[PDB]
Amino acid sequence: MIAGSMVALVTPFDAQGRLDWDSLAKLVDFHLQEGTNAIVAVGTTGESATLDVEEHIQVIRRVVDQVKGRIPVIAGTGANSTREAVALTEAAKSGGADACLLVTPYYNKPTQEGMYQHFRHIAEAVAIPQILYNVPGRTSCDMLPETVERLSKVPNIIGIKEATGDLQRAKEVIERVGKDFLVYSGDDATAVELMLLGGKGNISVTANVAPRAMSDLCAAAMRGDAAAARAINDRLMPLHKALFIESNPIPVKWALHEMGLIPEGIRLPLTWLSPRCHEPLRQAMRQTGVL
Amino acid sequence: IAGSMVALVTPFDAQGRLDWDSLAKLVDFHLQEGTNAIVAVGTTGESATLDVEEHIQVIRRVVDQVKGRIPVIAGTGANSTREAVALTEAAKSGGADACLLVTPYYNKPTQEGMYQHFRHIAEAVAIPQILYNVPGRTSCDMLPETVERLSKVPNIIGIKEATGDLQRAKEVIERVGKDFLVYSGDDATAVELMLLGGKGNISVTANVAPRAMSDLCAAAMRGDAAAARAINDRLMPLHKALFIESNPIPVKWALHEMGLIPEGIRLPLTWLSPRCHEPLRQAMRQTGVL
Ligand SMILES: [Cl-]
Ligand SMILES: [Cl-]
């Protein structure tokens, strides 16, 4: 089921920037062992922007083939061209993905109607479940709740990753969509509150490094155990903050390399975490018991 | 590379196919009306929805028609350094005089990552390169300290500053060498950026008012503030209405109304909403374009 703690998985690169399949296999085994509910491969945390079409499908198949159906595998397949998004989404389907996550078009600032038409088009073009993703702090556009509600009535559009961290927005979306349309957090610091409001999962950067804790956090929030959920969240807060001290996924790749899970590669225009940021993150990782 | 530089639309037919005859009409319109350069396949040209093959073909077609009469600048930015290098290499082979490279959108690089991205591209491809800062689209802002660093890299010849912030414009102009040229990417304020020492405007409004834009840039660049401002003030209703919905949705409606292009635009962009037709039509009539 496409709910709970879903890791926004990094894509590990060796120091020359090439895909590191051995390291990817370690990460997939770690999630399998620690209670992660789903894996999101080749999204923003996975450096979607710097993977070419051939690499995008390679990663998806390698994750799908290793997971062997044990938990869902969701593929990032958004683009700011409708045509490209269709091609990425068809590739995910061919690759064996259970669902796709599609960011709102970045850069070109479509109207709300253009957002509707874009997602309506992709939903009809490719028969795979699709999850919308609203992150205005990256895309420079905001899919408003009225538009989310319209798309919630389309076949194959199963939910939304809402990344604004605006809990008034979360509540408005949750109120306006059917109970079958699931609202997931895209903001690790506030995800507990979004799930307590009725959301059904967290597509999480923190989960890369604290998957068991995040799995426990989502389960607690999702059953309404507010005290338990907030307790884990409050303990993780320094790590949620540190993991965005420079743009995600720079901090989390540093953290995963410190854990011995991945190599030091990251592709331009992203850079390895600045040394001025290493202390706050290392401290958070020790404090939460991750390292 | 200076003056009124049109941020040229890419015309499509009703089924979304490239309309080469319409493109040629537009290039002739600019040649006749005093436009000083053409920026092909940028933001106003729907770079996002052109595939690699289409991108280069548009550049090739514009270059070949222009025949050296005015500079042709190609939009070649990307949010992957690897992609940006390929676009830039392609434009150079295609005969572009320069390339315009947006700062990486969506993935929010650090300032150091911006430096390394642009310096890599400037080393990789021997074609003049113009930086492009537009935080309202990219969700990152290239700060003047980074602009200055890059202004020392060979091959990096200028910057299109689209923030509309004239204190930002002044800071950039003061920090960089007199050889590194600062161009406006905000039509409403471009006149002031040129009066501050900027050297052109990479303009949406020039698509529909090329003569007026050319006259405005020439006045601003020789320091005739009164004449530059009077032209700009005249055009202001059009500058505003051309962003009533995200550019290039309004300007494509305007160019179709003028009879210059067909009514095609590629998803996720949509044809101008009906409620926006009147204010734009009125602004075009007020300003003498229609
Ligand atoms: Cl971030
Ligand atoms: Cl706009």
Chain B partners within 8 Å of A125 (Cβ): none
d(CA A129, CA A123): 8
Q: Quote the CA–CA distance of A19 and A59 in Å, as a whole number.
A: 9
Identify residue B270 by its one-letter amino acid code: T
Q: At what angle do helices B225-241 and B277-286 cross, to 10 degrees?
A: 160
Nearest to B107 among A83, A140, A269 (CB): A269
Known binder of ligand: residue B10? no
Cβ separation of B270 and A113 shorter than 8 Å? yes
Contacts of A271 in chain B (CB under 8 A): 109-110, 112-113, 116
Is the Cβ–Cβ distance between B23 and B45 less than 8 Å? no
Ramachandran sector of residue B106 (left: φ over 0; alpha: ψ -120 to 50; beta: rest): left
* Residue in A closest to B47 by C-alpha: A108
What type of residue sits at position B99?
Answer: C
Spatial separation of the C-alpha atoms in residues B131 and B155, rounded to whole Å: 11
Q: How far apart are CA B249 and CA B2, in angstroms?
A: 26
Smallest Cα distance from A112 to chain B, Å:
10
Please answer yes or no on whether B81 and A267 come within 8 Å at the CB atom. yes
Which tokens sit at B103? 């700062």
Quick check: B45 and B7 in contact, CB under 8 A?
yes
DSSP output for A157-173: EEEEEE-S--HHHHHHH
Question: Which residues of A lie closer than 8 Å to B, measured between beta carbons?
Answer: 44, 47, 49-50, 52, 80-84, 103, 105-111, 113-115, 117-118, 121, 137-140, 246-247, 250, 267-271, 274
Least distant ligand from the CA of B188: 2
Q: What separation in Å is there between the alpha carbon of A186 and the centre of ligand 1?
A: 11
What is the pairing mode between strands B156-161 and B129-133?
A: parallel
Distance from chain centroid for Cα A131: 11
What is the Cα Rg of chain A in Å?
A: 18
Nearest CA in chain B to A139: B106
- The length of chain B is 290
Of B46, B112, B139, the CB nearest to A271: B112
- Residue B214 φ then ψ, to 5°: -65, -45
How far is A290 from A211, CA to CA, in rounded Å?
A: 10
A77 vs B171: CA distance, rounded Å:
40
Report the alpha-carbon distance of residue A46 to residue A249 in Å, rounded: 7
Q: What pairs with residue B18 in β-bridges?
A: B12
Ligand 2 geometric centre to CA of B155 (Å): 29
Please answer whether residues B13 and B262 qualify as being in contact, where contact means their C-beta atoms are separated by less than 8 angstroms. yes
For residue A279, CA distances in Å to A83, A232, A262 come to: 43, 22, 19
Distance from CA of A18 to the nearest CA of B (A): 13
Q: Which of A106, A137, A271 sits opposite B113 (nearest CB)?
A: A271
The burial class, CB within 10 Å (0-12 / 13-18 / 19+), for B167 is exposed
**Nearest CA to A38 among A200, A154, A178?**
A200
Could you tell me the domains of chain B? 1-290 (3.20.20.70)
What span, in angstroms and rounded, lies between the C-alpha atoms of B129 and B164? Answer: 21
Spatial CB neighbours of B269, under 8 Å, sequence gap ≥ 6: A108, A110, A114, B46, B49, B246, B248, B249
Supply angle C-alpha A208, A211, A217, rounded to 5.
125
- Using the structure block, give the residue that is written with the tokens 């020790």: A286
Distance separating alpha carbons of residues A135 and A215, to the nearest angstrom: 23
Side chain identity at residue B233, one-letter code: D
B142-149: long-range contacts (C-beta < 8 A, 24 or more apart)? B142/B103, B142/B111, B142/B114, B143/B111, B144/B168, B144/B171, B144/B172, B144/B175, B145/B111, B145/B175, B146/B111, B146/B114, B146/B115, B147/B172, B147/B175, B147/B176, B148/B172, B148/B175, B148/B176, B149/B115
Complete DSSP assignment for chain A: ---EEEEE----B-TTS-B-HHHHHHHHHHHHHHT--EEEESSTTTTGGG--HHHHHHHHHHHHHHHTTSS-EEEE---SSHHHHHHHHHHHHHHT-SEEEEEPPPSS---HHHHHHHHHHHHHHS-S-EEEEE-HHHHS----HHHHHHHHTSTTEEEEEE-S--HHHHHHHHHHS-TTSEEEES-TTTHHHHHHTT--EEEESGGGT-HHHHHHHHHHHHTT-HHHHHHHHHHHHHHHHHTTSSSTTHHHHHHHHHTTSS-SB--TTS-PPPGGGHHHHHHHHHHTT--
Q: Which of B160, B183, B199, B252 is catalytic?
A: B160
**Cα(B213)–Cα(B191) distance, integer angstroms:** 10
Least Cα distance to B90 among A35, B82, B153 occurs for B82
Question: What single letter denotes the amino acid at residue A180?
Answer: D
Structure tokens at A110: 């479509």
B110 assigned binding-site residue: no
Q: Would you call A161 a catalytic residue per the annotation?
A: yes
Distances (CA, A) of A212 to A31, A232, B172: 8, 11, 49
Structure tokens at B264: 């095609």
- The resolution in Å comes to 1.6
Active site residue B160: yes
Instruction: Give me the sign of the Cα torsion angle A250, A251, A252, A258.
Output: positive
Please report where in the chains the tokens 């493109």 appear, as a residue.
Answer: B23
Rounded CA separation A39/A3 (Å): 11
Q: How far is ligand 2, taken at its centre, from the CA of residue B241, in Å?
A: 10
Chain B: closest CA distance from residue A70 (Å): 31
Three-state SS annotation for chain B: CCEEEEECCCCECCCCCECHHHHHHHHHHHHHHCCCEEEECCCCCCHHHCCHHHHHHHHHHHHHHHCCCCCEEEECCCCCHHHHHHHHHHHHHCCCCEEEEECCCCCCCCHHHHHHHHHHHHHHCCCCEEEEECHHHHCCCCCHHHHHHHCCCCCEEEEEECCCCHHHHHHHHHHCCCCCEEEECCHHHHHHHHHCCCCEEEECHHHCCHHHHHHHHHHHHCCCHHHHHHHHHHHHHHHHHCCCCCCCHHHHHHHHHCCCCCCCCCCCCCCCCHHHHHHHHHHHHHCCCC
Question: What is the DSSP track for A264-289?
Answer: SB--TTS-PPPGGGHHHHHHHHHHTT
Among the listed residues B132, B183, B199, B252, the single catalytic one is: B132
- Residue A117 CB-half CA count within 13 A: 16
